[PDB]
Design a protein around this nucleic acid. Structure first.
Ligand SMILES: [Mg+2]
Ligand SMILES: [Mg+2]
Ligand SMILES: [Mg+2]
Ligand SMILES: [Mg+2]
Ligand SMILES: [Mg+2]
Ligand SMILES: [Mg+2]
Ligand SMILES: [Mg+2]
Ligand SMILES: [Mg+2]
Ligand SMILES: [Mg+2]
Ligand SMILES: [Mg+2]
Ligand SMILES: [Mg+2]
Lengths: 71, 78, 50, 64, 85
RNA sequence: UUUUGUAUAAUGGGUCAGCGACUUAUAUUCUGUAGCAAGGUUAACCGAAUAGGGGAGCCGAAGGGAAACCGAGUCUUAACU
RNA sequence: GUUUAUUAAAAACACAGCACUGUGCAAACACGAAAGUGGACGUAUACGGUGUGACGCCUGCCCGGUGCCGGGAGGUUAAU
RNA sequence: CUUUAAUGUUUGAUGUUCUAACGUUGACCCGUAAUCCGGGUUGCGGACAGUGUCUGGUGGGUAGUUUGACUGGGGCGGUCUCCUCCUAAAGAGUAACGGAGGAGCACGAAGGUUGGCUAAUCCUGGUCGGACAUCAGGAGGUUAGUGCAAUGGCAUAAGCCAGCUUGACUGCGAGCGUGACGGCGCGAGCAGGUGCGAAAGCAGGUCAUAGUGAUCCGGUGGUUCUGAAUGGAAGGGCCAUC
């Protein structure tokens, strides 16, 4: 399991975030299966979270940026 | 356990108790002898020895006497 | 050293017990007290066990 | 070569956020009928390693 | 010359650890609630206003303020109170 | 030199010349200094081979809890003033 | 007679003699992973080990302890 | 079904006989001009002996080691952990093979409360009955008592008696004291439930200070916290305890 800061969502790709998509940007280890997005940094862009385990703080701070969280 | 009748079992029981009494008497003898040894001095700068002390300490043990009633039933004279 | 160790087992049905000592010679009758049971959060009867 | 961490120490201390080490209070393993519940309750939480013993711990745990 | 040396033995020689009794916060000292004032064995000092007594007869502050010592009472006993100062 | 303490009648050295004892791998923490900086840095390796590639990884920006898990909170607890 | 070459030559060791004990021969025993050797090209009047130590007069009592020998009934008891 | 008895059937034990494995350091023959070795006849033993694996016993024959410290030198004697007093110099602490004693528990009441009560000792009168038993009133005033050493304390009793009881609660805990740490101790108050009291209130063991043993390893109960592909489980962890 791994942690994802809100500052890494702008560092990944065009805007879709998933386990496979996070590894290709070298944010989590290639043998990581579960990731959680925490409220650590600040997200400015409309990022969509494909399948992950965002916290309530991270979730609100993503919708404020215009993002979307799904499974 | 025992295979036999009451009288044969009784005989076996007396033999068992006699052997136990003899072994207890031998234990008393050996304990007295080793106590006599313990109560001596070192005689020089030589051993005395802790192995024999340990043997005597473990030899000082407890045995269960038979709680046999036998002839004490006291009927007071009226 | 004649006070052996006993545990009072809750009668609430949960596995919970206080533990204490008891003179097994002078008090052969099993102990029985109404103590608190944090599992159910109610004062219930505890009975002596091994 | 790499320093071998004392493995027995790594089973009893965990590093905290600021660098201190947390451990589990002794005297809570057995012989618990004697001890009052007040004493046993206070020994249940984990404690922080003392200032004097921090040096001994850090040497035994150079990698964590 | 098997006479020069001599020896003996002793039957006492054991004591107990010291318990660090005595007054901890003296008169006029300002304390917080719960601070131990005197660690006694009996009741050399008795609990006064705003101070309490433990099972060891330890006198502790029940409020925060200055320690005071008094000899009030019909038996001329020393009492420790606390003034909320 | 060793000692509480040595002119010590305590140790060592006849004297000269030459040699003779805190080093070197790695790993880790701290200090100084230098570069970059929420980033820093590559290893093996490839290489017209002190360059340039190579970011596998490592450390860091998040912690709490034995853990699941939660997450600027978390654990304890039925709940915490 | 022997002995501590190099501070001890002796009352020490050995000794003939004595006793106990083991050993039936592919002997006991010893050396040797073993093969095999010695014992012994011997055979209980023989060989081994132990103690004592010419010779003379003798070698008293104790089998409880430790050991050894015999016994097999019963008890405890391994791997399976 | 119940007992029983018979021929069968399997199996197990013990025993006797046999030969064919195996042994032969018996004889003869051949390799071979060789008392080695091998092969062949034969005799004798014979599923014994012997060897391999496993196993019980014995095993200073051999091997590796252990065999504490303090100490008015070492050995010998004594001691080694805890509590009380003195040494200890009116805060704490403070050594000696200094001076004295104790502990390794007890108690479901000897704990909690609510009521009530107050001793030792002596004097006087009183049936056996006195030096001292129980009774009555007088002095006395805690010289008594405290589950057990000593010290401190205790009349509002902490001492003695009775009714009801289980707070000898569970989670915590401001703040302290004491330790080099491990640790140890005191604690108001908060939440949940409880006992006693009409209530105010008190109760998280006992008048206090001794009554003890880290960790590892393992045992028992509970808890799906974990569960090496997955669902379980085993094993772990957590809680309580041995
Ligand atoms: Mg039990
Ligand atoms: Mg001179
Ligand atoms: Mg000199
Ligand atoms: Mg640097
Ligand atoms: Mg005999
Ligand atoms: Mg025999
Ligand atoms: Mg040896
Ligand atoms: Mg009262
Ligand atoms: Mg309450
Ligand atoms: Mg009521
Ligand atoms: Mg499990």
């Amino acid at each position: 399991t791994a942690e994802i800061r809100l500052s890494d969502l702008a560092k990944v790709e065009g805007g879709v975030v998933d386990l496979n998509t996070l590894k290709a940007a070298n944010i989590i280890g290639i043998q990581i299966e579960f990731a959680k997005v925490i409220l650590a940094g600040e997200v400015t862009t409309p990022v969509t979270v494909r399948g992950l385990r965002v916290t309530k703080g991270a979730r609100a701070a993503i919708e404020a940026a215009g993002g979307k969280i799904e499974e | 356990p025992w295979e036999g009748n009451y009288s044969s079992w009784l005989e076996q029981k007396d033999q068992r108790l006699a052997q136990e009494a003899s072994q207890e008497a031998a234990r008393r003898k050996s304990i007295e002898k080793e106590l006599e040894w313990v109560r001596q001095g070192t005689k020089g700068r030589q051993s005395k020895g802790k192995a024999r002390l340990a043997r005597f300490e473990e030899l000082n043990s407890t045995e269960y006497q038979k709680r046999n009633e036998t002839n004490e039933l006291f009927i007071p004279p009226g | 050293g004649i006070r052996e160790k006993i545990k009072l087992v809750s009668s609430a049905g949960t596995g919970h017990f206080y533990t204490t000592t008891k003179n097994k010679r002078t008090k052969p009758e099993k102990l029985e007290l109404k103590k608190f049971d944090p599992v159910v959060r109610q004062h219930v009867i505890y009975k002596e066990a091994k | 070569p790499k320093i071998k961490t004392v493995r027995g120490a790594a089973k009893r201390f965990k590093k905290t956020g600021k660098g201190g080490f947390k451990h589990k209070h002794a005297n809570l393993r057995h012989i618990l009928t004697k001890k009052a519940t007040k004493r046993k309750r206070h020994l249940r939480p984990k404690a922080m390693v003392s200032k004097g013993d921090l040096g001994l711990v850090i040497a035994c745990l150079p990698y964590a | 010359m098997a006479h020069k040396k001599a020896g003996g033995s002793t039957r006492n020689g054991r004591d107990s650890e010291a318990k660090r009794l005595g007054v901890k916060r003296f008169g006029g000292e300002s304390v917080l609630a719960g601070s131990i004032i005197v660690r006694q064995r009996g009741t050399k000092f008795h609990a006064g206003a705003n101070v309490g007594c433990g099972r060891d007869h330890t006198l502790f502050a029940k409020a925060d303020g200055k320690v005071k010592f008094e000899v009030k009472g019909p038996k001329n006993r020393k009492f420790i109170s606390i003034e909320a100062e």
